[PDB]
Enzyme design. Structure first.
Site, PDB file in Angstrom:
ATOM      1  N   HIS A 101      -5.351   1.204  -4.664  1.00 33.79           N
ATOM      2  CA  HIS A 101      -6.360   0.582  -4.370  1.00 33.79           C
ATOM      3  C   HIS A 101      -7.468   1.571  -4.187  1.00 33.79           C
ATOM      4  O   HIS A 101      -8.383   2.126  -3.824  1.00 33.79           O
ATOM      5  CB  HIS A 101      -6.969  -0.184  -3.043  1.00 33.79           C
ATOM      6  CG  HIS A 101      -5.834  -1.451  -2.970  1.00 33.79           C
ATOM      7  ND1 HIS A 101      -4.734  -1.779  -2.194  1.00 33.79           N
ATOM      8  CD2 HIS A 101      -5.757  -2.561  -3.801  1.00 33.79           C
ATOM      9  CE1 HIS A 101      -3.670  -2.867  -2.586  1.00 33.79           C
ATOM     10  NE2 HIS A 101      -4.723  -3.300  -4.071  1.00 33.79           N
ATOM     11  N   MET A 108      -9.850   3.404  -0.852  1.00 34.83           N
ATOM     12  CA  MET A 108      -9.084   2.938  -0.132  1.00 34.83           C
ATOM     13  C   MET A 108      -8.355   4.406   0.369  1.00 34.83           C
ATOM     14  O   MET A 108      -7.376   4.679  -0.114  1.00 34.83           O
ATOM     15  CB  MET A 108      -8.106   2.052   0.574  1.00 34.83           C
ATOM     16  CG  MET A 108      -6.514   1.545   0.598  1.00 34.83           C
ATOM     17  SD  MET A 108      -5.805   0.534   0.822  1.00 34.83           S
ATOM     18  CE  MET A 108      -4.673   1.511   2.002  1.00 34.83           C
ATOM     19  N   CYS A 129      -4.774   5.522  -1.350  1.00 31.28           N
ATOM     20  CA  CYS A 129      -3.461   4.333  -1.776  1.00 31.28           C
ATOM     21  C   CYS A 129      -3.675   4.816  -2.905  1.00 31.28           C
ATOM     22  O   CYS A 129      -4.673   4.177  -3.535  1.00 31.28           O
ATOM     23  CB  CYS A 129      -3.807   3.366  -1.030  1.00 31.28           C
ATOM     24  SG  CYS A 129      -2.262   2.095  -2.130  1.00 31.28           S
ATOM     25  N   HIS A 186       0.318  -1.076   0.120  1.00 26.86           N
ATOM     26  CA  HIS A 186       0.507   0.327   0.098  1.00 26.86           C
ATOM     27  C   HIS A 186       0.879   0.983  -0.064  1.00 26.86           C
ATOM     28  O   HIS A 186       2.214   1.189  -0.053  1.00 26.86           O
ATOM     29  CB  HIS A 186      -1.010  -0.168   1.056  1.00 26.86           C
ATOM     30  CG  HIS A 186      -2.012  -0.837   1.482  1.00 26.86           C
ATOM     31  ND1 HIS A 186      -3.482  -1.618   0.588  1.00 26.86           N
ATOM     32  CD2 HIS A 186      -2.482  -2.015   1.915  1.00 26.86           C
ATOM     33  CE1 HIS A 186      -3.738  -2.890   1.030  1.00 26.86           C
ATOM     34  NE2 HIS A 186      -3.226  -2.732   2.254  1.00 26.86           N
TER      35      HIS A 186
HETATM   36 CU    CU Z   1      -3.780  -0.036  -1.166  1.00 27.94          CU
END
Ligand code: CU
Length: 102
Positions: free
Chosen positions: A90, A95, A87, A37
């Site tokens: 994502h 996210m 992130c 991440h």
């Molecule tokens: Cu992520």
């Protein structure tokens, strides 16, 4: 402040996803689990150049991921206000989190 980035199950979440800090208090983002991440702040259109610079400095590069090798990242934001971060990989998966600076 500390924020967990991901978990051991593989969810695309920050824990917690809202946090409040004092001006200049570092936020340490640390990876949990095996899924990579990162963390990048949204730069509002409208933000003063000084705030835009702060937010970029407080952001990972999008070519950069936290891993078991590089587990954490520390961000410092001085300007009082509320900021959103995400992130990169994502982002579509929602996210994201919020940072309030007192
Ligand atoms: Cu992520």
């Amino acid at each position: 402040a500390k924020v967990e980035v991901g978990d051991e199950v593989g969810n695309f979440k920050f824990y917690p996803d809202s946090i409040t800090v004092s001006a200049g208090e570092a936020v340490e983002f640390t990876l949990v689990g095996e899924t990579p991440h990162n963390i990048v702040f949204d730069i509002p259109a409208g933000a003063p150049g000084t705030v835009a610079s702060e937010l970029k400095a407080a952001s990972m590069d999008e070519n950069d991921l936290l891993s078991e090798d590089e587990p954490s990242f520390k961000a410092k934001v001085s300007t009082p206000g509320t900021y959103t971060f995400y992130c990169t990989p994502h982002k579509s998966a929602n996210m994201k989190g919020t940072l309030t600076v007192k």
